[PDB]
């Protein structure tokens, strides 16, 4: 993985974290 790949991976990583909390927050408002 090149630098750009490490960046898009970091980008995906940080977005994955947010992805989790989005589902967590959802579960407290409306699921499914």
């Amino acid at each position: 993985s090149t630098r750009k790949q490490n960046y898009m991976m970091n980008f995906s990583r940080q977005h994955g974290l947010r992805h989790f909390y989005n589902r967590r927050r959802r579960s407290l408002r409306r699921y499914p």
Side-chain angles (χ1 to χ4, degrees), residues 5 9 12 16 20 23-24 26 29-31:
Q5 305 185 31
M9 279 181 59
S12 190
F20 301 133
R23 290 185 176 176
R24 293 298 183 178
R26 178 187 173 200
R29 305 178 307 213
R30 161 63 202 206
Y31 184 86

Side-chain angles (χ1 to χ4, degrees), residues 11-26:
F11 162 85
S12 190
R13 202 70 189 190
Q14 74 180 211
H15 275 247
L17 294 181
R18 165 185 160 185
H19 211 266
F20 301 133
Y21 300 116
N22 266 329
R23 290 185 176 176
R24 293 298 183 178
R25 182 59 180 159
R26 178 187 173 200

